[PDB]
Amino acid sequence: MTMMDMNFKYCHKIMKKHSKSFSYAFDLLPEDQRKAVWAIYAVCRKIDDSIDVYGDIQFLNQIKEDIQSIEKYPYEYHHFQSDRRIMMALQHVAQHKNIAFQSFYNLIDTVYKDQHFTMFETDAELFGYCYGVAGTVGEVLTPILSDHETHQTYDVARRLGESLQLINILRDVGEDFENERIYFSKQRLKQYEVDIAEVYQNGVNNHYIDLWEYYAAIAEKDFRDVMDQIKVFSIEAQPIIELAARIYIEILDEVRQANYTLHERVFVEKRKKAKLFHEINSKY
Ligand SMILES: O=P(O)(O)[C@@H](CCCc1cccc(Oc2ccccc2Cc2ccccc2)c1)S(=O)(=O)O
Numbered sequence: 001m002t003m004m005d006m007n008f009k010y011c012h013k014i015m016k017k018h019s020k021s022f023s024y025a026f027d028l029l030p031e032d033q034r035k036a037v038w039a040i041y042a043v044c045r046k047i048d049d050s051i052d053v054y055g056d057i058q059f060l061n062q063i064k065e066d067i068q069s070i071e072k073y074p075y076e077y078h079h080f081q082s083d084r085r086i087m088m089a090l091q092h093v094a095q096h097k098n099i100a101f102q103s104f105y106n107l108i109d110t111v112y113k114d115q116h117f118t119m120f121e122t123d124a125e126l127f128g129y130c131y132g133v134a135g136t137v138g139e140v141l142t143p144i145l146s147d148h149e150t151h152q153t154y155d156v157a158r159r160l161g162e163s164l165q166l167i168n169i170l171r172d173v174g175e176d177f178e179n180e181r182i183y184f185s186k187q188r189l190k191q192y193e194v195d196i197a198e199v200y201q202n203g204v205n206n207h208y209i210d211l212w213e214y215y216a217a218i219a220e221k222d223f224r225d226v227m228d229q230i231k232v233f234s235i236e237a238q239p240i241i242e243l244a245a246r247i248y249i250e251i252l253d254e255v256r257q258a259n260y261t262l263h264e265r266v267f268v269e270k271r272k273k274a275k276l277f278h279e280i281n282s283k284y
């Protein structure tokens with residue numbers, strides 16, 4: 001094992017620990033591709049979690065400055081300020097692939113802003129946030145997942161990221177509420193006559209179910225559009241992306257089966273992930 005191998009193994013550890021779904025699917029990529037995906041995942045995870053290290057922006061600004069140094073001087077040796085293992089891996093990736101650095105900056109900007117979180121007035125703001133935290137990641141992954149990137153490749157990867165984030169939101173209503181976060185828009189909450197606090201206390205009702213399903217239908221339509229355009233991705237990535245998306249969308253059914261509970265995090269068991277791999281692997 002080389003030093004650079006050690007860096008990518010650490011990135012792999014982070015991904016496996018935090019997302020059983022995405023690790024399960026993306027670990028099926030060819031070696032060079034899955035290592036790049038691990039490095040991208042680990043950078044994004046570190047960004048996502050940066051505020052709680054100290055309680056402020058300091059680690060986030062370090063990550064940002066590390067990414068900036070890679071962008072400006074990808075073939076120079078850097079003394080990284082944040083997580084060296086991850087940044088060395090990211091830099092290695094940057095040497096071989098055309099990374100959308102502004103997408104990392106858009107994600108960092110979204111994390112900074114989230115410090116002053118106020119509820120989304122409209123769905124447009126909710127979808128802007130989905131772009132910021134997940135559509136951005138889709139854009140970063142695009143050159144890894146395709147041979148010849150076009151605007152469509154980015155569009156589809158963006159829509160995928162946004163669909164996956166909306167599913168995450170739909171899974172985590174209760175937990176987010178405990179953490180003083182509600183992601184459904186004020187406009188829709190008012191239209192559907194839903195008070196998340198009231199529902200967390202008293203259980204589901206038809207108004208809440210209708211609202212949850214309104215958003216679930218959006219995620220499902222997004223998912224279908226991505227599947228319909230899956231051929232933007234390289235032949236090797238196509239089944240992996242399909243698997244990842246299918247495993248993640250199965251979470252919607254898990255929520256329904258658990259009666260839309262606000263009090264546990266539902267999950268797709270490993271054996272069911274394998275069932276989906278079989279179905280997809282057979283298709284290809
Ligand atoms: O904002 P937090 O912190 O609440 C939240 C942070 C997570 C935000 C998010 C949600 C969903 C999907 C995302 O990225 C993708 C976009 C397009 C395609 C694939 C992927 C998955 C992927 C990422 C990298 C490498 C491989 C796979 C990102 S959380 O902690 O994970 O829930």
Ligand SMILES: [Mg+2]
Pocket residue numbers: 168169172
């Ligand atoms: Mg969540």
